[PDB]
Amino acid sequence: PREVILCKDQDGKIGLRLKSIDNGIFVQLVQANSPASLVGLRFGDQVLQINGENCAGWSSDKAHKVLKQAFGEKITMTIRDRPFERTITMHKDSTGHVGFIFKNGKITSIVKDSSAARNGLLTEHNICEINGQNVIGLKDSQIADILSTSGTVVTITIMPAF
Template sequence: GSDAGLRRAAIKPGLREIHLCKDERGKTGLKLKNVDQGIFVQLVKANSPAALVGLRFGDQVLQLDGESCAGWSSGKARKALKKASPEKIVMVVRDRPFQRTVTMHKDSTGHVGFVVKKGQIVSLAKDGSAARNGLLTHHYVCEVNGQNVIGL
């Protein structure tokens, strides 16, 4: 039998196919990173082609131009983007599979109980609102009260 059907993305809830192009300098404005055998969006530059098609930090790239990205290194993903057509790069993306929204409350001293460095949670107060809501060290904070805080 033909395996063409296996390579074609089955678009399911939470998955979307996007068509990305490169700017006049040949850039997408996208940085990809391997995390646990998957390829994830690490950075989206403001007003870049990647931003304009709605890619966001934490999105998982499942396919790039019909090829599965599972097991790719960060370098392989970077090379695949670089050699892709400037007019149309077809990607299948899962929207932030590990995203969670939590509501926290400040304690009497005005703290919610975690410390962030470079967007990553580096420590938690033992009985703070953050710990009670299931936040963990090494997690990244993407938004606070609806405002993007990536890169701040």
């Protein structure tokens, strides 16, 4: 786990939304060019403590409350970098495709005899990055376009959908 110190922007904002999952707190959205992005926060990071207080069991509503009510300009956090993450490298065939359907940023079926099949891609998982590009918060058509334009090698990072 690592310590990070976020400095609030002039607006009072750090550019971070947190979510309650399995009685922990997880990074859910990191805004571009924000205090949160500066210190290297990503979707799926786990927040163990904020200003010395355990996040365990906090609701999403609470976590938002605690960040909003943080006195002062610096907020300290203890982070476990994305603990649930599987990165799979596939390769396009002459479908020009890798072999999967997705919807709302989540994989929904695996095509038989495809590189996604050969490489054990899993359904009910969120797509987080494609070839090093963050796709959290993108539209399905934007993800499809990144896949369409990709070279043969497609490396995807996934997480459980929780």
